[PDB]
Scaffold this active site. Structure first.
Site, PDB file in Angstrom:
ATOM      1  N   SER A 122      67.598  65.549  24.687  1.00  0.00           N
ATOM      2  CA  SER A 122      68.427  64.280  25.340  1.00  0.00           C
ATOM      3  C   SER A 122      69.251  64.485  23.674  1.00  0.00           C
ATOM      4  O   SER A 122      69.702  64.774  23.121  1.00  0.00           O
ATOM      5  CB  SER A 122      68.504  62.978  25.811  1.00  0.00           C
ATOM      6  OG  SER A 122      69.394  62.349  26.479  1.00  0.00           O
ATOM      7  N   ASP A 186      73.004  68.592  34.623  1.00  0.00           N
ATOM      8  CA  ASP A 186      72.707  67.436  33.806  1.00  0.00           C
ATOM      9  C   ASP A 186      74.113  66.769  33.476  1.00  0.00           C
ATOM     10  O   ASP A 186      75.026  67.321  32.957  1.00  0.00           O
ATOM     11  CB  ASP A 186      71.685  68.573  33.501  1.00  0.00           C
ATOM     12  CG  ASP A 186      70.776  66.967  31.863  1.00  0.00           C
ATOM     13  OD1 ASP A 186      71.732  65.884  32.320  1.00  0.00           O
ATOM     14  OD2 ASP A 186      70.333  67.543  30.780  1.00  0.00           O
ATOM     15  N   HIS A 316      68.290  66.133  34.591  1.00  0.00           N
ATOM     16  CA  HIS A 316      68.503  65.391  32.696  1.00  0.00           C
ATOM     17  C   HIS A 316      66.661  65.785  32.874  1.00  0.00           C
ATOM     18  O   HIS A 316      65.912  65.426  31.877  1.00  0.00           O
ATOM     19  CB  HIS A 316      69.078  64.252  32.621  1.00  0.00           C
ATOM     20  CG  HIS A 316      68.599  64.278  31.015  1.00  0.00           C
ATOM     21  ND1 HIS A 316      69.597  64.589  30.196  1.00  0.00           N
ATOM     22  CD2 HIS A 316      68.237  62.992  30.599  1.00  0.00           C
ATOM     23  CE1 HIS A 316      68.966  64.241  28.930  1.00  0.00           C
ATOM     24  NE2 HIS A 316      68.585  63.495  28.829  1.00  0.00           N
TER      25      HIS A 316
END
Ligand code: BGC
Lengths: 619, 524
Positions: A122, A186, A316
Site C-alpha cells: 500500500s 486493486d 488489495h
C-alpha cells in the site's frame, strides 16, 4: 523468463512480501536481514492525511521535488524538476529522521556489500519507491557498483511521481530496479489518478476498509461504489487525454480544453506486474501501464458492474495469494510480445483498450527508430567533415591571420568566412532537428544521458557556438533584440551544456549553478552575495562557450560599471582553457576583440590581473 | 467480418469520452436550462465560478423558413463587426441573418460584457460561452467577436453549442480552416440531427452524440457527410442526450458509430495535412542554409569581379560550373518554393492570424526578395522578355514588397549612412530590370534602321530618366557597390551609354569617368 527480465527472483519477492507484512507491526519501517540480502519494509498508513496532505493546496496533493536533494529527478535540457505526492514525500522524510536508525542501517548494509531491498504494501510501497530514489541519489550515483544496485518491490502501491519522475528514472537507467505488483482490480494504485475533491467524502471510509487491521468500520455499499465510480471517471479522463496527446494529433482542441481540465500528474514508474488467477503480465512502458490501470479494472458483463467496486477493495488484500501462487501462473513480458492479445484478454482489456495499449507500445518503438536514424546521420562522413573543417582548416588559418576565427567570422572579409557560415547553418539544422524530437518526447528517455551524444554535442557547442555568437553580433541583433545570453542564445546549446554538466557533475553530487556560485565567491570580491547575483544575472560566464557573448557585453562600457563582471570572466578563464571550453590559441591574438579590448582597461587592473603575462599593450 | 479500428477513429472516441467525463457539457447544459425557466430578443446570464466564467446565451425559437437567409460581410464594409476575420483570399463571408441580426441588435450590452471577459482572461481565468439552438449561434458569433483582437498568449475561450443551426458559409469555413479560432468551438449535436447544408457550412469541432457514446469530428467534410440532409431537424432534449452518454460510460459497447468510408476520408485528409505543414521548423532551417549558400555564392562572384547577377545569368546561358548549377537548381528553387508558400499561407489566414505570421517574416522576407528577385530578373531578360517591373514580377515578390518594403526600410537606411556598404542588398529589388531596360533602349537607338526622329527623342528621354534614377540611388547610398564590378551589366550599360550620349556632361558622368565609384559605399 521472469527473473532474467526483472532482475529479481521468487525468493526476493517472497521475502519482500513477508517483510511488508511485518512492517505493519513496527514504527515507520522493518529491517529484515536475510544473509546476503537486507530488506527495508515500510509501514503503510490508511488515513486520508497520508494520501493527500492537509496543508497541500493543489488538486492532487502534488509537490515539485527539491533540485538540491534530488538533482537527477528532472529533465536535463528543459530543466523542469519532477513532481511527487507530498504526503508520501513527508512520510519518507519521517523515516530518514536520524532517530529511526534507518539511514545508519542503510549505511551499515552498504559497507557490508549486501543486496539492499526497499519494499512495502500500500502506501508503504509508495515510501519504498521514494526511499529507493533517495538511496540512488545519495549513494549509488556517487559510486555505482554492482553491489550497490538496489531493488524496489511494491505490492498494491499508489502512484508516486509524474511523467518527469518516470522519465528521469529511465534516463539514469534506474527504472530497471523497480517492480510494482498490482492485483488486477486493486483500487489503490488507481486512487491518486482522481482529483482529491472527487473522493474527499468517501476516501476516509474506503481507506478504513482497505486497512487489514480495521475490522471495525462497518462496510458500506454506497460509499465504496461512489468511490470506485469517482476514481474510474477521473482515471478515464487522464487515460483518454494521454491517448490523444501521445499520437501528436488534435493539439489545438486539446490546448483549448486544457484550461478547463484538471488531470492527475501521476504516472507509472518502473516495471508493473498485473496479476490474475492464471496470469502474470509484466509491463515496462509507463504509457501502456497508465491505459491498463483503467482497462484492467472494468466489468466483463454489464451484470458484473455491481460486483467490481467490492472486488477492487478485496484485491488489495490478495497479495498473499499472489505471492504463494507465483510459480503456478503463466508469465509474459508485454513490451516484448509479438502479440499482446492473449495477455490483455485475460486481464479483461476490451478491444479498444488493447489498441490504446498497442499505440503506447508502438510509440516507444518509434522513439527507438528515431534514435537509430540520428546515429546514422551523425556518424556519416559528410556530417563529421563539417566539424573537422572548422577545427582543422578554418581555425588554424584564422589564427595565422592573427585575429582568430571569431573575429574573422564577424567581419567576414573572405570566402572562407562565408564557407564557415554555411557549415554553421548546416550544423544548426541537424542539432535543431534533434532538439525538436526531444521537445516532443520522440526519443528514448536515455538519450540525453548517452555519452556518445554528449561527446558530439559538446564538441559542437565548443566549436560552433562562438560562430553563432559572432553571427548574432555581426547582424547587430544585440542592439535590436538584446544581449545574446538573455534573448538570443539558441536552445540547442543550452541543452548541450546541461547534458554535459549533468554527466560530469552528478557523480560528485553537485549541480552546475552551485559549482558556479561557489567559484564566484572564491574570487574574493568581498561584496554581498545578493548584490553580486544581481550583477551576474544572465552572465556569459556560466558557460565557457559563451565567453565571447560576455566580452561583447562588457566592451564599450566604463570600467566602474562592469568591474565585477570583468574579474569574474578572468577567474573562469584558465579552467575553461584546461577543460577545453575556450581555445587558448585564439582569445589572446593581436587582432582578437578580447585582446584589443583588454588592453584599453585601466592599468591598475592589468598589473595584478592573471592575464597580464598573456597579453602585451601596444606602443 | 470486421478489421481493427483506425487511428483517427480511436482519437474521436477518446476525445469524445474525454469531453463527456469532463463534466463541461453537463455544467453548460444545466445553466442553459436555468435561463429559459427559473420581449423576444437576445438574453444572457453570467455565471462566475471558481474554475471559470460561464456565459449562457438565449434566443427566441428558430424560424425555419429563414434557414438559408444570409448576410454578406465584406472587409471594406464599415458596418462589418469582423474585419480581422477576413483574409486576402476571402475578403468577404456570409452569416446566418437571424443570428447576425440578434448579435448586432445587442451590440451595446455585449460590448460592456466584452470588457469584463477580456479582463477575466487577462487574470488567466478561463471563459466559456454557451447556448442552445439559435442562442448557440449567437454564442458562436460572440466568441468570434471576442477572438477579433484578443491576446494570443491568453487562454482561449471555449464556445459550446447544443443543437445549433449552421452559422457561416463556405467562405467563412475556408477562413476558419486556417485559423486558431476554429479550435474554440465545440458544436454538440445528436446523431439523429440533420442539416440542409446547401449554403451554410460547418466550422469548428463537432461532438456527435449517439445512444451508446459520442465522437469528436474536426474534419468539416466528414461532418458534412454525417449531418447533411434534405430536412432541418428540430432541437432534441439534450438533457436526455447527456443522460444516455453517462450510461454509455458504464457500457461494454465499443461499437463503430462512424461509417467505414467516412473514416477513409478523414484519414486521407489527415495525412495530407501532416505534409501541408511544410515544416516551418525544419524547412525554416533549410531556408537559412540555402540563403547561406547564396551569400557564399555572392561573395565568390564578387571576388572574380563579375557580381552574382551576371555570373548567374552567364551560367544560365552556358552551364559549365557545378557549384553555380547547384545554386540555381537547388538553393534558389528551394528559396522560391518556400517564400511562395509563405505568401500563400499569409493570404489564406484571417487578418488577425496573418498579421502575426507577417511580423515573423518581416526582415527575412525583405532580405530574400532583395537577394533573389535579381536572379529571376536575370532569367526573365535572358529569355528575351520585356518590362519586368510592370508585366513580369512573380506575385509573391510583389506581396513581400507590399508588406515589408515600407517599415524596415527606414531603420536600415539609418545604419547605412555611416557603415560600409559591402553587404548591402540593393533596396530596389527591380534595379537590374531598370538596367536591362535601358540596355534595350540603347540597342534600339543603335540598331533600329529608319527610326523616326520623334521616336528617337522619346527613347533618349528614357535614357536620361534612368540616369537620374541611377544617380539618385547612388547619392542616397541605396545601391550595392557590386554594380561597379568591371564585368557587371551596369558597367556594360555605362560603356554603351558613354558612346551614345557623346560630349555632354553630368554628375554621373564625372562620377564614373573620375572613377569616384571606387570610394563609394565606404564608412563615414
Ligand atoms: O526497456 C524498458 C524501458 O522502460 C521504460 O520505463 C524506460 O523509460 C526506458 O528507458 C526503458 O527502455
Amino acid at each position: 523468463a521472469f527473473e532474467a527480465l526483472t532482475g529479481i527472483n521468487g525468493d526476493l519477492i517472497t521475502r519482500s512480501w513477508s517483510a511488508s507484512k511485518q512492517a505493519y507491526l513496527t514504527e515507520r519501517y522493518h529491517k529484515e536481514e536475510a544473509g546476503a540480502v537486507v530488506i527495508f519494509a515500510f509501514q503503510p498508513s490508511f488515513s486520508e492525511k497520508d494520501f493527500f496532505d492537509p496543508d497541500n493546496k493543489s488538486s492532487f496533493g502534488e509537490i515539485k521535488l527539491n533540485r538540491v536533494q534530488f538533482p537527477c529527478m528532472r529533465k536535463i535540457g528543459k530543466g523542469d524538476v519532477a513532481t511527487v505526492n507530498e504526503a508520501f514525500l513527508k512520510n519518507l522524510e519521517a523515516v530518514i529522521d536520524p532517530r529511526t536508525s534507518f539511514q545508519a542501517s542503510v549505511e551499515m548494509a552498504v559497507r557490508s556489500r549486501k543486496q539492499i531491498v526497499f519494499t512495502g504494501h500500500s502506501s508503504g510501497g509508495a515510501t519504498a519507491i521514494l526511499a529507493t530514489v533517495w538511496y540512488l541519489e545519495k549513494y549509488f550515483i556517487r559510486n555505482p557498483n554492482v553491489y550497490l544496485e538496489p531493488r524496489c518491490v511494491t505490492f498494491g502501491a499508489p502512484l508516486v511521481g509524474d511523467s518527469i519522475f518516470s522519465h528521469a528514472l529511465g534516463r539514469e537507467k534506474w527504472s530497471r530496479f523497480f517492480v510494482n505488483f498490482v492485483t488486477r482490480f486493486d483500487i489503490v494504485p488507481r486512487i491518486t489518478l482522481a482529483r482529491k475533491a472527487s473522493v474527499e467524502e468517501t476516501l476516509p471510509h474506503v481507506l478504513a476498509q482497505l486497512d487489514p487491521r480495521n475490522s471495525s468500520v462497518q462496510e458500506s455499499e454506497q460509499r465504496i461504489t461512489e468511490f470506485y465510480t469517482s476514481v474510474m471517471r477521473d482515471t478515464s479522463t487522464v487515460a483518454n487525454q494521454a491517448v490523444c496527446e501521445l499520437t501528436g494529433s488534435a493539439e489545438a482542441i486539446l490546448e483549448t480544453l486544457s484550461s478547463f481540465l484538471e488531470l492527475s500528474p501521476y504516472r507509472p514508474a518502473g516495471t508493473f506486474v498485473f496479476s490474475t488467477e492464471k496470469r502474470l503480465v509484466a509491463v515496462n512502458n509507463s504509457d501502456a501501464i497508465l491505459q491498463m490501470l483503467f482497462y484492467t479494472c472494468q466489468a466483463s458483463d454489464e451484470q458484473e458492474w455491481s460486483l467490481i467496486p467490492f472486488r477492487s477493495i478485496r484485491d488489495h488484500h490478495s497479495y498473499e495469494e499472489l505471492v504463494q501462487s507465483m510459480g503456478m501462473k503463466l508469465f509474459n513480458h508485454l513490451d516484448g510480445e509479438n502479440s499482446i492479445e492473449s495477455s490483455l484478454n485475460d486481464l479483461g482489456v476490451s478491444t479498444r483498450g488493447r489498441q490504446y495499449v498497442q499505440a503506447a507500445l508502438e510509440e516507444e518503438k518509434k522513439r527507438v527508430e528515431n534514435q537509430k536514424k540520428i546515429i546514422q546521420v551523425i556518424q556519416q562522413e559528410r556530417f563529421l567533415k563539417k566539424l573537422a573543417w572548422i577545427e582543422d582548416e578554418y581555425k588554424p588559418k584564422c589564427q595565422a591571420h592573427k585575429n582568430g576565427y571569431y573575429d574573422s567570422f564577424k567581419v567576414s572579409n573572405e570566402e572562407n568566412d562565408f564557407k564557415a557560415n554555411v557549415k554553421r547553418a548546416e550544423l544548426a539544422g541537424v542539432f535543431d532537428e534533434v532538439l525538436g524530437l526531444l521537445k516532443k518526447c520522440q526519443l528514448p528517455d536515455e538519450f540525453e544521458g548517452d555519452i556518445d551524444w554528449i561527446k558530439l554535442a559538446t564538441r559542437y557547442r565548443r566549436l560552433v557556438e562562438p560562430l553563432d555568437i559572432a553571427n548574432y553580433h555581426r547582424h547587430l541583433k544585440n542592439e535590436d533584440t538584446g544581449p545574446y545570453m538573455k534573448r538570443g542564445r539558441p536552445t540547442r546549446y543550452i541543452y548541450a551544456q546541461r547534458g554535459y554538466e549533468h554527466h560530469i557533475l552528478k557523480p560528485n553530487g553537485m549541480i552546475a549553478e552551485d559549482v558556479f556560485w561557489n567559484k564566484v565567491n572564491g574570487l574574493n570580491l568581498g561584496l554581498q552575495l545578493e548584490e553580486i547575483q544581481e550583477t551576474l544575472k544572465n552572465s556569459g560566464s556560466e558557460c565557457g562557450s559563451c565567453f565571447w557573448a560576455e566580452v561583447e557585453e562588457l566592451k564599450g562600457k566604463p570600467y566602474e560599471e562592469v568591474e565585477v563582471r570583468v574579474k569574474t570572466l578572468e577567474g573562469m578563464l584558465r579552467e575553461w582553457i584546461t577543460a577545453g571550453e575556450v581555445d587558448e590559441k585564439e582569445i589572446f591574438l593581436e587582432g582578437s576583440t578580447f585582446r584589443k579590448w583588454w588592453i584599453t582597461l585601466p592599468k591598475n587592473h592589468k598589473s595584478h590581473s592573471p592575464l597580464r603575462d598573456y597579453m602585451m599593450d601596444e606602443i | 467480418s470486421q478489421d481493427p479500428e483506425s487511428s483517427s477513429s480511436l482519437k474521436g472516441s477518446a476525445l469524445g469520452k474525454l469531453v463527456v467525463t469532463s463534466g463541461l457539457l453537463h455544467s453548460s447544459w444545466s445553466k442553459i436550462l436555468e435561463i429559459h425557466n427559473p420581449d423576444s430578443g437576445l438574453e444572457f446570464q453570467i455565471h462566475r465560478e471558481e474554475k471559470f466564467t460561464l456565459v449562457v446565451f438565449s434566443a427566441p425559437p428558430i424560424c425555419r423558413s429563414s434557414s438559408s437567409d444570409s448576410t454578406l460581410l465584406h472587409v471594406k464594409d464599415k458596418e462589418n463587426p469582423f474585419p480581422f476575420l477576413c483574409s486576402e483570399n476571402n475578403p468577404s463571408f456570409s452569416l446566418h441573418t437571424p443570428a447576425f441580426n440578434l448579435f448586432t441588435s445587442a451590440s451595446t450590452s455585449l460590448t460592456y460584457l466584452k470588457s469584463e471577459l477580456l479582463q477575466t482572461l487577462k487574470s488567466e481565468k478561463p471563459v466559456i460561452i454557451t447556448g442552445a439552438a439559435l442562442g448557440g449561434s449567437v454564442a458562436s458569433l460572440y466568441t468570434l467577436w471576442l477572438l477579433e483582437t484578443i491576446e494570443p498568449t491568453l487562454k482561449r475561450p471555449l464556445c459550446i453549442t447544443f443543437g445549433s443551426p449552421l452559422i457561416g458559409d463556405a467562405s467563412l469555413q475556408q477562413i476558419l480552416e486556417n485559423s486558431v479560432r476554429n479550435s474554440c468551438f465545440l458544436h454538440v449535436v445528436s446523431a439523429q440531427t440533420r442539416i440542409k447544408m446547401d449554403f451554410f457550412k460547418p466550422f469548428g469541432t463537432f461532438l456527435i452524440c449517439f445512444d451508446s457514446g459520442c465522437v469528436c469530428i474536426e474534419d468539416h467534410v466528414a461532418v458534412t457527410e454525417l449531418l447533411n440532409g434534405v430536412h432541418d431537424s428540430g432541437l432534441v432534449d439534450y438533457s436526455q442526450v447527456l443522460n444516455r452518454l453517462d450510461q454509455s460510460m458504464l457500457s461494454l459497447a465499443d461499437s463503430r458509430l462512424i461509417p467505414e468510408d467516412v473514416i477513409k476520408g478523414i484519414e486521407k485528409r489527415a495525412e495530407m495535412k501532416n505534409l501541408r505543414f511544410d515544416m516551418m521548423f525544419k524547412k525554416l532551417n533549410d531556408m537559412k542554409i540555402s540563403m547561406a549558400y547564396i551569400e557564399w555564392y555572392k561573395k565568390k562572384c564578387k571576388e572574380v569581379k563579375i557580381g552574382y547577377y551576371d555570373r548567374f545569368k552567364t551560367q544560365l546561358a552556358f552551364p559549365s560550373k557545378e557549384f553555380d548549377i547547384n545554386i540555381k537548381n537547388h538553393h534558389k528553387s528551394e528559396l522560391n518554393r518556400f517564400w511562395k508558400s509563405v505568401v500563400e499561407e499569409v493570404e489564406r489566414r484571417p487578418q488577425s492570424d496573418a498579421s502575426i505570421l507577417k511580423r515573423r517574416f518581416l526582415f527575412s522576407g525583405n532580405n530574400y526578395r532583395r537577394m533573389i528577385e535579381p536572379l529571376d530578373i536575370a532569367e526573365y531578360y535572358l529569355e528575351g522578355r520585356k518590362e519586368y517591373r510592370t508585366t513580369g514580377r512573380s506575385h509573391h515578390y510583389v506581396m513581400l514588397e507590399k508588406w515589408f518594403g515600407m517599415e524596415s526600410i527606414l531603420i536600415e537606411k539609418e545604419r547605412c549612412k555611416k557603415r560600409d556598404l559591402s553587404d548591402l542588398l540593393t533596396f530596389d529589388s527591380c534595379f537590374w530590370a531598370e538596367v536591362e531596360d535601358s540596355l534595350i533602349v540603347i540597342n534600339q537607338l543603335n540598331t533600329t534602321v529608319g527610326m523616326r526622329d520623334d521616336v528617337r527623342e522619346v527613347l533618349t528621354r528614357k535614357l536620361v530618366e534612368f540616369e537620374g534614377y541611377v544617380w539618385e540611388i547612388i547619392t542616397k547610398r541605396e545601391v550595392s557597390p557590386e554594380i561597379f564590378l568591371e564585368e557587371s551589366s551596369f558597367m556594360k550599360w555605362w560603356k554603351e551609354y558613354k558612346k551614345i550620349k557623346g560630349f555632354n556632361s553630368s554628375y554621373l558622368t564625372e562620377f564614373m569617368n573620375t572613377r569616384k565609384y571606387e570610394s563609394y559605399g565606404k564608412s563615414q
